[PDB]
Design a protein around this nucleic acid. Structure first.
Ligand SMILES: [Ca+2]
Ligand SMILES: [Ca+2]
Length: 327
DNA sequence: CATTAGA
DNA sequence: TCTAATG
């Protein structure tokens, strides 16, 4: 957590680069187990060799380990940090539509800059366009204070179209976050469930609602279960407009909310931990269902849920307010 | 780990 | 169809 940090961060930095800047899935996959193991070790690794004893740590990772150690720095690390091409790549990727293949691509195209990207808007697809269009507003945070107004509105329209609509503003927000990076709506409807062969419109209805009303303003990505876009808060009696926010609406089968519901809200560790427990408590949890174990090794049969509580009632835990779902 | 775009 | 990018 700190006695081997440098070895890990040095290492991720090492992974990360092979990933993106180069096609080294492997080497990249390399720095990652290693950077994970050394992450675990209880003692200060004082040498490469020591380190090398570990699993996943061949001649390779060790080498850099010693250099890191001796000297407060690394060459490879110093060189990339310096590498414009590669810098470019890290940069472009900040672009909501651009991933590794792209960035590497424009880069070879000669587009490395934000500006460069503007000059060639044509080269960018719809996503990459919006992405290019709300770059400043993509990077900023969504004050809960805004999350606040934002949630309301959306619950506002949803109830409107249909009163049988259940949605929730899942995530860190849900969990008190003084700030959130984007809004996330987990939506269901009784007439939608595992089998009852859809009703895309079930999704589509709201989409159009939030639209007609202006809140939605663009479309990043629409599907019949997974909407992905942009939104905005009605700029008041002027002088203070709102910035552009990402947002994502998603349809779910009444019969699998609470999990999914439980499930997104995290925290990342709260999930895993409540989850581990469930193993003891003879159960099987996952984003959509909870299943009771069977000695044979594994078992099937998704228990019936009704609200967050049911999941809990089952593994015999303390109902936890999302509030304190931090871990 | 699943969905959507898009070519 | 597959590949890509997001969660
Ligand atoms: Ca080894
Ligand atoms: Ca990006």
């Amino acid at each position: 957590e700190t006695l081997n940090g440098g070895i890990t961060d040095m290492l991720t930095e090492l992974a990360n680069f092979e990933k993106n800047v180069s096609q080294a899935i492997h080497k990249y996959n390399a720095y990652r187990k290693a950077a994970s193991v050394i992450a675990k070790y209880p003692h200060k690794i004082k040498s490469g060799a020591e380190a090398k004893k570990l699993p996943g740590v061949g001649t390779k990772i060790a080498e850099k380990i010693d250099e890191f150690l001796a000297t407060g720095k690394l060459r490879k690390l110093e060189k990339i940090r310096q590498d414009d091409t590669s810098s470019s790549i890290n940069f472009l990727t900040r672009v909501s539509g651009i991933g590794p293949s792209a960035a590497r691509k424009f880069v070879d195209e000669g587009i490395k800059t934000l500006e460069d990207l503007r000059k060639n808007e044509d080269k960018l697809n719809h996503h990459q366009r919006i992405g290019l269009k709300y770059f400043g507003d993509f990077e900023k945070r969504i004050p809960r204070e805004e999350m606040l107004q934002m949630q309301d509105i959306v619950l506002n329209e949803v109830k409107k179209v249909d009163s049988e609509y259940i949605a929730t503003v899942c995530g860190s927000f849900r969990r008190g976050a003084e700030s959130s990076g984007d809004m996330d709506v987990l939506l269901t409807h009784p007439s939608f469930t595992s089998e009852s062969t859809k009703q895309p419109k079930l999704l589509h209805q709201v989409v159009e609602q939030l639209q007609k009303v202006h809140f939605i303003t663009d479309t990043l990505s629409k599907g019949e279960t997974k909407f992905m876009g942009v939104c905005q808060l009605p700029s008041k009696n002027d002088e203070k407009e709102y910035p552009h926010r990402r947002i994502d609406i998603r349809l779910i089968p009444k019969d699998q909310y609470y999990c999914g519901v439980l499930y997104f809200t995290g925290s990342d560790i709260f999930n895993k931990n409540m989850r581990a427990h469930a193993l003891e408590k003879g159960f099987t949890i996952n984003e959509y269902t909870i299943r009771p174990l069977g000695v044979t090794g594994v078992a099937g049969e998704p228990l019936p849920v009704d609200s967050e509580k049911d999941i809990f009632d089952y593994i015999q835990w303390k109902y936890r307010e999302p509030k304190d779902r931090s871990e």
